[PDB]
Symmetry: C3
Subunit: 337 residues, 3 copies
């Protein structure tokens, strides 16, 4: 939906320098922007390049203004303003509009105002959908689960039974919330299933990427705090608790009963042991092997990175035989002393 540059600047709390009557149709990268587009500059090295940008307007700082070759929106934080103006001008469609005739909705489900449910979605008994909730095509929402106002599920999302999801969440396709945790007792080598009768509680403003799995708790609950962001294909095991505003990048695997504090950042492909705690304000870099609890804030890392194969072969053999190397060092220390 087009907008006048002056009106866009007002909504962004930005200082307009140029023609307020310019009509902005959408956001584009600096290299792709054309007439009608607004873009942004975060790297002052592109000041000399602005004359090569064909956008109708550019978001920049006060220091950048003398280098402009277009209408400019001056702000303190061009990146944040970019996020805000991309939401104003978002072209992303909704997962559904209205309630599709092919959706199958139990008579006991409770629908709020302005709820949309896509084709062939399945809503179980007792489900409660808040105002403005959107359920994509082909989703399944299990018995008695509740989804808060403004939350949206893309196509082919699976929500099991007794799940609680807060307001203004966003869940991408393929995600499964509330499957059985990996709970079994061993009986003379045979695995005896332990029913998982806990739930999943997801807070407000949670975003979950595609094909992520969040299992329900065994007795008490798996809990996702407010404002948490989770990338694609993470495994959040039963009775994991993730604190508010924590970010979990793609492909992270967590074991059961792990507690992650608030304000943490878990890098992609990390692996985290269970029945332990990570305190607030912890950053684990990508592929971290998290075996022990983390009790102090800060940045933690693991992994021996890539080498040419010929070189790696020796690195690996030497590390595997490092005990012998250690004994040789000690022996030579004694001989010299």
């Amino acid at each position: 939906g087009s907008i006048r540059l002056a009106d866009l600047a007002q909504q962004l709390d930005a200082e307009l320098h140029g023609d307020g009557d310019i009509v902005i149709t959408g956001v584009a990268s600096m290299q792709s922007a054309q007439t009608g587009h607004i873009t942004f500059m975060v790297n002052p090295k592109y000041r000399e390049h602005l004359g090569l940008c064909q956008a109708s307007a550019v978001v920049m700082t006060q220091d950048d203004l003398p280098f402009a070759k277009s209408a400019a929106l001056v702000v303190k934080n061009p990146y944040l303003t970019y996020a805000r103006m991309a939401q104003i001008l978002d072209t992303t469609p909704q997962p559904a509009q209205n309630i599709a005739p092919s959706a199958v909705i139990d008579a006991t489900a409770k629908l709020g105002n302005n709820v949309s449910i896509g084709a062939n979605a399945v809503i179980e008994s007792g489900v409660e959908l808040g105002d403005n909730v959107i359920i994509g095509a082909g989703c399944f929402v299990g018995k008695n689960s509740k989804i808060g106002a403004g939350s949206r599920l893309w196509a082919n999302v699976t929500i099991y039974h007794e799940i609680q999801i807060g307001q203004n969440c966003l869940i991408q396709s393929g995600t499964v919330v509330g499957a059985d945790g990996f709970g079994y007792a061993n009986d003379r080598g045979n695995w005896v299933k332990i029913p998982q009768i806990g739930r999943v509680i997801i807070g407000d403003r949670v975003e979950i990427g595609a094909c992520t799995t969040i299992d329900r708790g065994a007795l008490d609950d798996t809990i996702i705090g407010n404002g948490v962001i989770i990338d694609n294909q993470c495994q959040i095991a039963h009775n994991v608790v993730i604190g508010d505003n924590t970010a979990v990048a793609g492909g992270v695997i967590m074991a059961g009963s792990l507690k992650i504090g608030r304000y943490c950042m878990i890098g992609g492909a990390s692996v985290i042991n269970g029945h332990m705690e990570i305190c607030d304000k912890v950053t684990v870099t990508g592929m971290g092997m998290v075996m022990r609890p983390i009790t102090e804030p800060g940045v933690y890392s693991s992994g021996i990175p890539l080498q040419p194969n010929k070189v790696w072969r020796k690195t690996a053999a030497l590390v595997m035989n490092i005990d012998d190397m250690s004994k040789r060092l000690k022996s030579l220390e004694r001989k010299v002393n």
Copy 2:
């Protein structure tokens, strides 16, 4: 709801308390209220049992003196907990009866008391045994057979010519029987090898969510009886998993791997193919399995987490460990 005396009988536990107590469900020790039964395994909880508000606590004999409520004595409280949770299970069924929106090929063979959920799709030639439950939105491909008592949750995908035994359970998002990753090369161009093998899943198999089990190239991918597989796992074509083996979340297996019985593969492990792991092998989390394993026991790999400042130095020295080795050899020669 069940009387404590009757529950203790079905669990073969010795009752120490009022058997007329009504038990309505299971709860954790910290959450239990009147009417709940709970359990304890770690002796550290003996001391605040007076604070637990459960109507009954499953415990061992040595725990009995510390009991502050009715108690059921057993040898293995965790196994008894498993059993009593099944008796008191509240989990609903994926479906009940056959939904009008389900699309079922007329040549499908359905046993007695088969339930198929809304908008599930059943292909031609499919055979569903007695008491099988198919969740909403599932797909079951041509000529696949699912044994009596087995259950699929919503949005499970079974390809064609798949065989699943009795009393299995498959969680949502899982895909059984996709093409294995098989290709020939014709001057840099990948040439697809059709994957016309199958997947054979035994009895009492439980598979997690968003797990993938590829069909074999010519012969079959085989999952033994009693196997349990967690979420986000990849089981490549022609993998064979022995009975009662457990695979934790996020495990990736390459093609033609053979795993024995009673194994335990820790989460996020990576197991390479065309090799065998013997019975009774445990691989700890993130294990990097490159070589065959021929002796039972516990195996591990990986350098664990350190503070970033410390890790920088560790990784740099490790990557230059060959120079360290050469310097040590030189020093030995000089001395």
Copy 3:
């Protein structure tokens, strides 16, 4: 499906030795093959074993021929011939046939000739499906997405909006193409979602496995080249670019804005970080931890393999304390240097 051996041999450009009138009904492994099956031998150690194989015909080399105990098709490359003959005798069914009445298709969708759409699939407005496209049951294809002629989706595949897929592609079930990239800004300690309005562009002859995810770009596009093959459980982040004919094995994770060249081979469970480039003809072995750009072709590797747990505990402790070992070595060198 069934074919005379002589005709099969002709289509494979193979030299027939034996009865061309034999009727071949399918392909089977050497151990499983029975009458009517054709099989193949790539390992000459099985020459002594051919008398135990009950296939009606065996594909082999000229050097193998004296060891045959059946009709033989002689070729230069038995493995490639096996791929070709398995395609000829393929028993894999199609994901769908015709347009299912339970499918929900927007009136503005444009369908080519001989399109098939499986039961309960959902096709959004503006979608374009090329000739001979097959959409499996339960799929979702989002607004304005385009799927090229001959391309096929198995059941329960999710294609978001504004996605472009080329010709003769194949996508296995549970895969998600075009979900939001992992993009967020920071407003005084609060995550602010960055709309991901780029796309995914997939070329021709691309094969993608099951439960793989390929996110759309933030502004510009995530791009998959022609002839690329991608295994199960892979994660391709926003704005990744993959060059033609590259192969990505199962469970690989690629972070945002990674560019991978042509003819690369990425081993299973590798982790490739973003905002960097990997040149043509690079092989990364399994579980490789890629933190830096790769500018020369060749084979690269990382990882310390498995050991018995008691041994690993000692290895891990010594490695974690390697800075102390380095300092002791340097001290000893000074002593040996008489300083």
